[PDB]
Coordinates of N, CA and C in Angstrom, one line a residue:
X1 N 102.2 165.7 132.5 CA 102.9 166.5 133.4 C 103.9 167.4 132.7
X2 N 104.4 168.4 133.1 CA 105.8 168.9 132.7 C 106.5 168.3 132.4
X3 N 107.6 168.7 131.0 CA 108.6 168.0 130.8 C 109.8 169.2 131.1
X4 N 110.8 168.9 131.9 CA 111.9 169.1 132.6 C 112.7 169.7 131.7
X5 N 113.7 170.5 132.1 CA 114.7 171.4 130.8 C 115.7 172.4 132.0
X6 N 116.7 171.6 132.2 CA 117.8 171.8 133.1 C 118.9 173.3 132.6
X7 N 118.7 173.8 133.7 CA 120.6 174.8 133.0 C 121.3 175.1 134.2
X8 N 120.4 174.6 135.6 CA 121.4 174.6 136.6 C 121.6 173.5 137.4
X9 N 123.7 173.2 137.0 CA 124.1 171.7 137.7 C 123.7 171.2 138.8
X10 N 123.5 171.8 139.8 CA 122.8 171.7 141.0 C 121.2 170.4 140.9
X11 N 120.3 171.4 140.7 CA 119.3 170.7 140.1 C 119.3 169.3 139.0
X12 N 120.3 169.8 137.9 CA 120.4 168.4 137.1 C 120.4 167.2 138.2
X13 N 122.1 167.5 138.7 CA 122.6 166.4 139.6 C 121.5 165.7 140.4
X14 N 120.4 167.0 141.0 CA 119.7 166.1 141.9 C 118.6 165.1 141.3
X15 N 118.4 165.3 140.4 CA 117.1 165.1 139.2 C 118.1 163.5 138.9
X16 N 119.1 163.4 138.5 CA 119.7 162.4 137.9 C 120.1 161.6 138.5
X17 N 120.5 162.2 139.9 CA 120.6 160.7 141.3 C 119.7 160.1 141.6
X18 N 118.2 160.3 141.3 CA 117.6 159.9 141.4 C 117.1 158.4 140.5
X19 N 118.0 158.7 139.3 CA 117.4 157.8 138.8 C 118.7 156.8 138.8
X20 N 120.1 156.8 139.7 CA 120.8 156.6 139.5 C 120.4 155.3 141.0
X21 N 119.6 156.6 141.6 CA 119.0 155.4 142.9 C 118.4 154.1 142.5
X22 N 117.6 154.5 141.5 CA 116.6 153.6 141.3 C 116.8 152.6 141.0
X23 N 117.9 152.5 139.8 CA 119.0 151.7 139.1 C 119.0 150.7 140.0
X24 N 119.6 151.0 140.9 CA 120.6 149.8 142.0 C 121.6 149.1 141.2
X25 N 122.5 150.0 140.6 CA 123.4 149.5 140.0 C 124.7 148.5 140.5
X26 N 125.1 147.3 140.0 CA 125.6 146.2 140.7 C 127.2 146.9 140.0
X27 N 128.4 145.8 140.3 CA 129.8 146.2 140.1 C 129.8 146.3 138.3
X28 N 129.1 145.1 138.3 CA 129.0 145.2 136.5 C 128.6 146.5 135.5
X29 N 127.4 146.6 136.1 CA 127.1 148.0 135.6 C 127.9 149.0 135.7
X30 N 128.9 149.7 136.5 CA 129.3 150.3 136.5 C 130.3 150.3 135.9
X31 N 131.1 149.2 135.8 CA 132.2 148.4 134.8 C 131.8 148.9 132.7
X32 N 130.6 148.4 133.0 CA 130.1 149.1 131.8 C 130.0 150.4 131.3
X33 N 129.3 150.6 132.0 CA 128.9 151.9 131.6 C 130.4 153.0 131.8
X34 N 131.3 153.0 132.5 CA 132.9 153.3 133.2 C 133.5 153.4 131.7
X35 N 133.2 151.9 131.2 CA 134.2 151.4 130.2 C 134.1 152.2 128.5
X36 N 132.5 152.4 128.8 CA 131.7 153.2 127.6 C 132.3 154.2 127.1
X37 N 132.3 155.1 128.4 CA 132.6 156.7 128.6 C 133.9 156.7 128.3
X38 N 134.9 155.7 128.4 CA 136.6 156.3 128.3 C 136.2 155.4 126.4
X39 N 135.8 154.8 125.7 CA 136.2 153.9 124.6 C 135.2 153.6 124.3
X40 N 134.1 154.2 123.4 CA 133.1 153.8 122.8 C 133.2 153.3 121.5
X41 N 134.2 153.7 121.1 CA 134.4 152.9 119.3 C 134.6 151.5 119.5
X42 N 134.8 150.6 119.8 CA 134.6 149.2 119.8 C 133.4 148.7 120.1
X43 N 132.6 149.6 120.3 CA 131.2 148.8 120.4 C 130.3 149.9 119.1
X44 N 130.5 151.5 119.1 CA 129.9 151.6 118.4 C 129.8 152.0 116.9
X45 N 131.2 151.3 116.9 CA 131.4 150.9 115.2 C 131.1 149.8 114.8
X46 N 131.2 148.8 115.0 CA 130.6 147.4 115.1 C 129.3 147.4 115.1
X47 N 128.3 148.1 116.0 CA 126.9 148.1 115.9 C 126.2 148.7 114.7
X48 N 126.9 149.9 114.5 CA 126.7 150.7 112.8 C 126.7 149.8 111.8
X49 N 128.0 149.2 111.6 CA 128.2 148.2 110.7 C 127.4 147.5 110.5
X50 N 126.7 146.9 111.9 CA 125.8 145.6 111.8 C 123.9 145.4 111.6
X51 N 124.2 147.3 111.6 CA 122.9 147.5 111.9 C 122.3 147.6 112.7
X52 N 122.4 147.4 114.0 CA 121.8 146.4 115.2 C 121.4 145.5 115.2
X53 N 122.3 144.7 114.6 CA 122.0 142.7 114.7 C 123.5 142.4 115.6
X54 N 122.7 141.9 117.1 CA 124.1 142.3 117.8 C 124.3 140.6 117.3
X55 N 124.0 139.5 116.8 CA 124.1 138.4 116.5 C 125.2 138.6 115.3
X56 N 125.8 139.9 115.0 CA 126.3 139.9 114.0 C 128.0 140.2 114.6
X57 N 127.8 140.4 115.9 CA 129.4 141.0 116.4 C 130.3 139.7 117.3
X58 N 131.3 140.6 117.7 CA 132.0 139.5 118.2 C 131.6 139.3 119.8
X59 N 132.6 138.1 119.8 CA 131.5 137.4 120.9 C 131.9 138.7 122.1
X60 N 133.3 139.1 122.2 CA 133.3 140.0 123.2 C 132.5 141.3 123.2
X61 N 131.8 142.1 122.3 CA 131.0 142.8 122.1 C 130.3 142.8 122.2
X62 N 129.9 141.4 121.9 CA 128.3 141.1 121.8 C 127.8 140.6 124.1
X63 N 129.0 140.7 124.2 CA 129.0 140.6 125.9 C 128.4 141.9 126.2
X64 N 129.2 143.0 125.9 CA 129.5 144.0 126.1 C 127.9 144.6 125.7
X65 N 127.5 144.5 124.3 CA 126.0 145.1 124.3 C 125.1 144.2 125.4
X66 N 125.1 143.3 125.2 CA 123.9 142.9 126.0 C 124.3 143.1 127.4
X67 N 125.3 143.7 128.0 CA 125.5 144.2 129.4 C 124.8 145.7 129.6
X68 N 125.2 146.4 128.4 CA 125.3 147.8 128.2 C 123.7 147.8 128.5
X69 N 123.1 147.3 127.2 CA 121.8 147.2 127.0 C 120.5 147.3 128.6
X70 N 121.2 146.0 129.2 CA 120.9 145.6 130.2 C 120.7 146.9 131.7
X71 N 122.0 147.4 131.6 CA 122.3 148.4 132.8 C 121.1 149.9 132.4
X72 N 121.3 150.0 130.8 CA 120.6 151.2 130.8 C 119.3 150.5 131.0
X73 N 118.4 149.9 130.8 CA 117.1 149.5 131.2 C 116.8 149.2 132.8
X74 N 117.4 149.1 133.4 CA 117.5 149.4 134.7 C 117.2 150.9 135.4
X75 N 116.7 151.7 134.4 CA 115.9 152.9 135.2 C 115.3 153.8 133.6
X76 N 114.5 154.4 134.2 CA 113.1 155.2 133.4 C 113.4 156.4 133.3
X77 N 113.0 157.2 132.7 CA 112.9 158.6 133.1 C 111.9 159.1 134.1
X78 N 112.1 158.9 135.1 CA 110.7 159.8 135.8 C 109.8 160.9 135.8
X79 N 110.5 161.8 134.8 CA 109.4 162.8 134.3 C 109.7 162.8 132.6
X80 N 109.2 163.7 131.7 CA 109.8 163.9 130.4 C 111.2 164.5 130.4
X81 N 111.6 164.7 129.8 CA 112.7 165.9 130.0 C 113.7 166.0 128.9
X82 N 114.1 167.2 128.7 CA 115.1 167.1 127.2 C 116.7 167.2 127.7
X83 N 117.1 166.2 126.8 CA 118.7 166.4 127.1 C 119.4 166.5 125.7
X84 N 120.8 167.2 125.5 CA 121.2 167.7 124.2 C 122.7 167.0 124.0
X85 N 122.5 167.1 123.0 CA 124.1 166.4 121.6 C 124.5 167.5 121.4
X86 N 125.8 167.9 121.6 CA 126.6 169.0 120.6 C 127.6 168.3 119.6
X87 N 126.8 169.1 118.6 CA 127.3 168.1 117.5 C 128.6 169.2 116.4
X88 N 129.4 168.5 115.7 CA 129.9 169.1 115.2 C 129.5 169.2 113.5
X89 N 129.7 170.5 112.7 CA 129.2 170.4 111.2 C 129.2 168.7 110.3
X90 N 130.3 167.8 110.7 CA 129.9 166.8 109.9 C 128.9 166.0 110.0
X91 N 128.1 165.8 111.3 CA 126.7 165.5 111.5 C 125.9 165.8 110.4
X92 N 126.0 166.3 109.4 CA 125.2 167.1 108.8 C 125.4 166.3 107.3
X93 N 126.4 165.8 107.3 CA 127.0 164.9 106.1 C 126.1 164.1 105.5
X94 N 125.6 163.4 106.4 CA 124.7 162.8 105.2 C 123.1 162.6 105.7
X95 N 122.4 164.2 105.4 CA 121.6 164.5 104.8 C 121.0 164.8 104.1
X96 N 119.4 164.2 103.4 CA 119.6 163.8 101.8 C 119.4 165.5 101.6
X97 N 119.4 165.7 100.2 CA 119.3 167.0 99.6 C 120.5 168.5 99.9
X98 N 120.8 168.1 101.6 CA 122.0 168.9 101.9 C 123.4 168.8 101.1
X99 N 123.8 169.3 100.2 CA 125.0 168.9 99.6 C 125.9 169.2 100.9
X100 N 127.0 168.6 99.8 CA 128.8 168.9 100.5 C 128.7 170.5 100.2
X101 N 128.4 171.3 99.2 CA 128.6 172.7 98.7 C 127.8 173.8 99.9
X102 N 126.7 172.7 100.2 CA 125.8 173.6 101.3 C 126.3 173.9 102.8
X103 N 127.1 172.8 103.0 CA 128.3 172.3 103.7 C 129.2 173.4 104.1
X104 N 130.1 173.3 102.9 CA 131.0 174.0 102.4 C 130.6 176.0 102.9
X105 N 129.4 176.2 102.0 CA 129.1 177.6 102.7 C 128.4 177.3 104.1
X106 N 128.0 176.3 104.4 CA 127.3 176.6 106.3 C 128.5 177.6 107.0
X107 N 129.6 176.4 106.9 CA 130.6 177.0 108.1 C 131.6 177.8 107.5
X108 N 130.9 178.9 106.3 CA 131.8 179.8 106.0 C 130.7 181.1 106.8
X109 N 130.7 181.2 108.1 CA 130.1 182.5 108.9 C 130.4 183.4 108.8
X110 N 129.6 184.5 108.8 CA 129.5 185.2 108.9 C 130.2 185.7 110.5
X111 N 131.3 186.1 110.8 CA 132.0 186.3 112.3 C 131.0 185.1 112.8
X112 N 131.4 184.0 112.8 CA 130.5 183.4 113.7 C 129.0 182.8 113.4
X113 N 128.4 183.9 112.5 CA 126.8 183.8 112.3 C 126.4 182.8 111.2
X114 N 125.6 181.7 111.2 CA 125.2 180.6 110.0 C 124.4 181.6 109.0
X115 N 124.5 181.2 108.2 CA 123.5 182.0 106.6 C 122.0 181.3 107.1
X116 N 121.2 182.0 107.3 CA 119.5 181.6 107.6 C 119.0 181.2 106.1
X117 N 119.3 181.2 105.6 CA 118.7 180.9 104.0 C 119.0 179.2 103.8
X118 N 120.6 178.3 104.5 CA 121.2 177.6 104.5 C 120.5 176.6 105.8
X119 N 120.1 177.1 106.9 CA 119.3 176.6 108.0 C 117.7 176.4 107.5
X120 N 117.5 177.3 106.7 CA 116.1 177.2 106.4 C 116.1 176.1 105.2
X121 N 117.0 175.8 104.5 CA 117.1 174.7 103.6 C 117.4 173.4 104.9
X122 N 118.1 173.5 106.0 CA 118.1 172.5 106.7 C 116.6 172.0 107.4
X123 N 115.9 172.8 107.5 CA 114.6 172.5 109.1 C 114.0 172.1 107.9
X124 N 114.2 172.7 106.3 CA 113.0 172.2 104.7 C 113.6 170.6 105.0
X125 N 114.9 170.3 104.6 CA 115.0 168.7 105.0 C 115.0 167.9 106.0
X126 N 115.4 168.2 107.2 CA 115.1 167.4 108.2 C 113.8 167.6 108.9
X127 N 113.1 168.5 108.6 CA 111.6 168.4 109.6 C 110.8 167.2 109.0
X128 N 110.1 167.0 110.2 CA 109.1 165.7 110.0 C 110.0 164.4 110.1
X129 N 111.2 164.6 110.0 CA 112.0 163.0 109.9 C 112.6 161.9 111.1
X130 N 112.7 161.0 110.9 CA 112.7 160.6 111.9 C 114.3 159.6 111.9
X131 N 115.8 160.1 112.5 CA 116.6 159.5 112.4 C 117.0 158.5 113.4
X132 N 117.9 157.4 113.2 CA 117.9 156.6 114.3 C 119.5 156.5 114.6
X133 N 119.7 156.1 115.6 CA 121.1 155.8 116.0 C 121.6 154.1 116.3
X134 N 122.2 153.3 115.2 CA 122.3 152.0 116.1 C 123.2 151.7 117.1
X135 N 124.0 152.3 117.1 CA 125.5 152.8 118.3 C 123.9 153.3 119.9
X136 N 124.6 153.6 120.8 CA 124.4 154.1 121.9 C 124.3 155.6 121.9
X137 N 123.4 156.8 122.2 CA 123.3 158.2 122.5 C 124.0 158.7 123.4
X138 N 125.1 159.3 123.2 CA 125.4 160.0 124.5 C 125.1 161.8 124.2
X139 N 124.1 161.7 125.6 CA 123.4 163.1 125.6 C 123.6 163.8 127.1
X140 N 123.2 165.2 127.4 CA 123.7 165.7 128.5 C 121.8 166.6 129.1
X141 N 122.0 166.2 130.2 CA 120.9 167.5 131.1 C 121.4 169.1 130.6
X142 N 122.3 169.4 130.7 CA 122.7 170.4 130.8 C 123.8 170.9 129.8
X143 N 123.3 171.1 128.5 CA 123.7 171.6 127.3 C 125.1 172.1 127.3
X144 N 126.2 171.7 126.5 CA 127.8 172.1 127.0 C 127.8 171.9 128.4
X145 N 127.9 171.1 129.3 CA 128.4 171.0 130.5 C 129.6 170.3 130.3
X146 N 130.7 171.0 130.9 CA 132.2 171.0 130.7 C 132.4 170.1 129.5
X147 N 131.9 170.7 128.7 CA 131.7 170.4 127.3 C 132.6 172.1 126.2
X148 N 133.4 172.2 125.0 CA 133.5 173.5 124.8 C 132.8 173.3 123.8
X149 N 131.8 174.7 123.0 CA 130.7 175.0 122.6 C 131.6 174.6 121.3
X150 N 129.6 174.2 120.3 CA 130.1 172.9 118.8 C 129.4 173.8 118.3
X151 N 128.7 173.8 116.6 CA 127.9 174.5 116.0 C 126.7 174.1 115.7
X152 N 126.4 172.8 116.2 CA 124.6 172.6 116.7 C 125.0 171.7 118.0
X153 N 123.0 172.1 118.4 CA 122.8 171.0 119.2 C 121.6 170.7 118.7
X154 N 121.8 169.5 119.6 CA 120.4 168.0 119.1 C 120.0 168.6 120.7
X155 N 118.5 169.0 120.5 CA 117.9 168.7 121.8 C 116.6 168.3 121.7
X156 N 116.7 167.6 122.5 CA 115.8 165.7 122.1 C 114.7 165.5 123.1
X157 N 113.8 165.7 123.0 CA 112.6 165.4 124.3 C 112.2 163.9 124.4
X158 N 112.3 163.7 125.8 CA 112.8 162.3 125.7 C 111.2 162.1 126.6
X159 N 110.3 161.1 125.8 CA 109.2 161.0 126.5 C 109.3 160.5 128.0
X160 N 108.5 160.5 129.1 CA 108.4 159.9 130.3 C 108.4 158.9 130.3
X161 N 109.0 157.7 131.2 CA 108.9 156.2 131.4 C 109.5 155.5 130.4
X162 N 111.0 156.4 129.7 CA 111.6 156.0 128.5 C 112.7 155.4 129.1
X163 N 113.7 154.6 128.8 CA 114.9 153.6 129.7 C 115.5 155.1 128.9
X164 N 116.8 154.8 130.3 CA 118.0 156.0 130.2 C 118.7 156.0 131.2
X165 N 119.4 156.0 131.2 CA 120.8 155.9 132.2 C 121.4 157.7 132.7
X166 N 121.3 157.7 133.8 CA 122.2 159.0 134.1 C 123.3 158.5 134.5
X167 N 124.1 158.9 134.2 CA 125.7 158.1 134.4 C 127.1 159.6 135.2
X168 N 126.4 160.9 135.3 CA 127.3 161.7 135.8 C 127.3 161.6 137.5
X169 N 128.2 160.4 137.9 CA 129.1 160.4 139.3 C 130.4 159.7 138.3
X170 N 131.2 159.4 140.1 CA 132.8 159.6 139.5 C 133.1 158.3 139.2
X171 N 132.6 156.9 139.8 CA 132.8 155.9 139.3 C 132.5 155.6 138.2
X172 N 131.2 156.4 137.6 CA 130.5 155.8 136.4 C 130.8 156.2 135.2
X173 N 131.8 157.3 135.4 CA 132.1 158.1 133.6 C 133.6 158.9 134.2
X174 N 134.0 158.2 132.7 CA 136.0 158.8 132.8 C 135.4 160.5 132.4
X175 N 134.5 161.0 132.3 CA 134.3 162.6 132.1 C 133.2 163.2 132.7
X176 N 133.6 163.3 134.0 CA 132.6 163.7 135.1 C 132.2 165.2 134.4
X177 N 131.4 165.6 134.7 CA 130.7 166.9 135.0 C 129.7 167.3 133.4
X178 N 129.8 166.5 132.7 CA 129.0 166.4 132.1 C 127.6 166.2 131.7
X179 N 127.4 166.1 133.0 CA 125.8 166.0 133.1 C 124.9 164.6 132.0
X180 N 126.1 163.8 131.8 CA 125.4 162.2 130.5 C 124.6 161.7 131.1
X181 N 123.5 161.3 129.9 CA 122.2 160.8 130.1 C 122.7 159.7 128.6
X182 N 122.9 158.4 129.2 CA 122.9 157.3 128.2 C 122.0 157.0 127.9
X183 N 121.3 156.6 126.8 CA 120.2 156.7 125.9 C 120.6 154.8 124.9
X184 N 119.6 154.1 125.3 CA 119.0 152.8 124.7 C 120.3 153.0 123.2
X185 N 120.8 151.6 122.5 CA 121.2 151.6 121.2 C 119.7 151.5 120.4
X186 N 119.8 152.0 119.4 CA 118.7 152.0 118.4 C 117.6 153.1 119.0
X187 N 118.5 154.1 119.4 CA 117.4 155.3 119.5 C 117.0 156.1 118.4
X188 N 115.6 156.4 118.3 CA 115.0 157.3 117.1 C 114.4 158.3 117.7
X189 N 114.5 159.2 116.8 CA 114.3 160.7 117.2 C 113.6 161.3 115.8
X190 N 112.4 162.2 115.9 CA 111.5 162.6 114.9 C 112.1 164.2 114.9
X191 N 112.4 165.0 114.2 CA 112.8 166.5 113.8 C 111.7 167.1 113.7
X192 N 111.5 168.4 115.0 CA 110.3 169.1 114.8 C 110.9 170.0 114.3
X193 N 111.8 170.8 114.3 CA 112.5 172.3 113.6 C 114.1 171.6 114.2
X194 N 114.4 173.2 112.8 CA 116.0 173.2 113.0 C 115.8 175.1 112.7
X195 N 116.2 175.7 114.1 CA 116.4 176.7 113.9 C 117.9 177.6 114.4
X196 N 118.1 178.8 114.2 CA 118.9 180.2 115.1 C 119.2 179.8 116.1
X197 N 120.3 180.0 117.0 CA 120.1 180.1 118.6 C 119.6 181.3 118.8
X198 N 120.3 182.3 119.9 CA 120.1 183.6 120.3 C 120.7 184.4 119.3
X199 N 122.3 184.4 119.0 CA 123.3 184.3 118.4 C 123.1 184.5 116.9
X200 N 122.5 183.8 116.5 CA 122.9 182.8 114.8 C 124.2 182.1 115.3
X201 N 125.0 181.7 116.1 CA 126.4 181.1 116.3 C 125.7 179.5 116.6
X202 N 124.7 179.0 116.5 CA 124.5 177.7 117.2 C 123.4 177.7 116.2
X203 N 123.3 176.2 115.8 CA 122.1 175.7 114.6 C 121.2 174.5 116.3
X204 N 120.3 174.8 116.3 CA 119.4 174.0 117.3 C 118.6 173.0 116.3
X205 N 118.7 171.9 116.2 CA 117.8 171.1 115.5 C 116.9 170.4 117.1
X206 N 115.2 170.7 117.2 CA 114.7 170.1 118.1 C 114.1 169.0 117.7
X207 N 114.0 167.7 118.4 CA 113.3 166.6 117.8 C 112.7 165.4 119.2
X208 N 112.2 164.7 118.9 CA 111.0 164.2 120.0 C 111.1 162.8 119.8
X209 N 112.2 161.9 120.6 CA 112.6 160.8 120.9 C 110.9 159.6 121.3
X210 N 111.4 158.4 120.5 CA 109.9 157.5 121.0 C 110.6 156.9 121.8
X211 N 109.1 156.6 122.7 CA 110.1 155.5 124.1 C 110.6 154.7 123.4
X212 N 111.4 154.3 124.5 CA 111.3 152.7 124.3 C 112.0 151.9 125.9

């Protein structure tokens, strides 16, 4: 079927209540996921550390993942659809072959514009690869939504029938309008390119999430 690719809030919202229906989310869930959105470093710095061996955290955490865990598998994606990360240049830090110097000239622009010589050394090392997150994704339907513009985005095709959480209403996230799509801990994602936006002002790295 089609996979889905949002730029007007209207539509997100309706697309994302749906899966927000499906959920039937209890008091807890929403406690969770509520709790996520305002304070995510106590859970996903501990999970980095640990790898994803939640057997490795503390006992309050280890509550806390296996709740988190829990709420987001309580709904699917109903069609494919891509949702995006705006990321900031340190994302970029530790990629093998990309020096700090490469670094160093990315975000010396040109008014604004990345060196294409510098991106094209990027899509040479990240294509074909496949990175993972053991922390939690937080990703959006709708690219910067009340969000202010970063110098890449991650936009991530999330296959159909994959667990994910839409979490933009008012009880469920201290930063409404964002259009967040919570995404499984230990999500991986495979890099098909890293190219230009319209601009040159935005590095787009695209890459193709496995279910899970």
């Amino acid at each position: 079927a089609e996979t889905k690719n949002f730029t007007d809030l209207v539509e997100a919202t309706k697309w994302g209540n749906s899966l927000i229906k499906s959920a039937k989310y209890s008091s807890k869930d929403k406690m969770a996921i509520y709790n996520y959105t305002k304070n995510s470093s106590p859970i996903n710095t501990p999970l980095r550390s640990a790898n994803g061996d939640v057997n490795k955290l503390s006992e309050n955490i280890q509550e806390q993942v296996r709740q988190l865990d829990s709420t987001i598998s309580k709904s699917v994606t109903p069609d494919s659809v891509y949702v995006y990360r705006l990321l900031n240049l340190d994302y970029l830090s530790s990629i093998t072959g990309f020096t700090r110097e490469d670094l160093h000239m990315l975000q010396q622009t040109n008014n604004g514009q990345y060196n294409e010589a510098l991106v094209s050394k990027l899509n040479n090392l990240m294509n074909s690869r496949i990175y993972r997150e053991n922390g939690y994704s937080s990703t959006q339907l709708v690219s910067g939504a009340a969000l202010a513009g970063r110098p890449i985005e991650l936009k991530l095709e999330l296959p159909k029938g994959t667990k994910a959480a839409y979490i933009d209403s008012k009880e469920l996230t201290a930063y409404p309008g964002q259009q967040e799509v919570l995404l499984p801990r230990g999500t991986e994602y495979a890099v098909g390119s890293v190219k230009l936006s319209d601009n040159k002002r935005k590095i787009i790295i695209t890459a193709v999430v496995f279910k899970k």
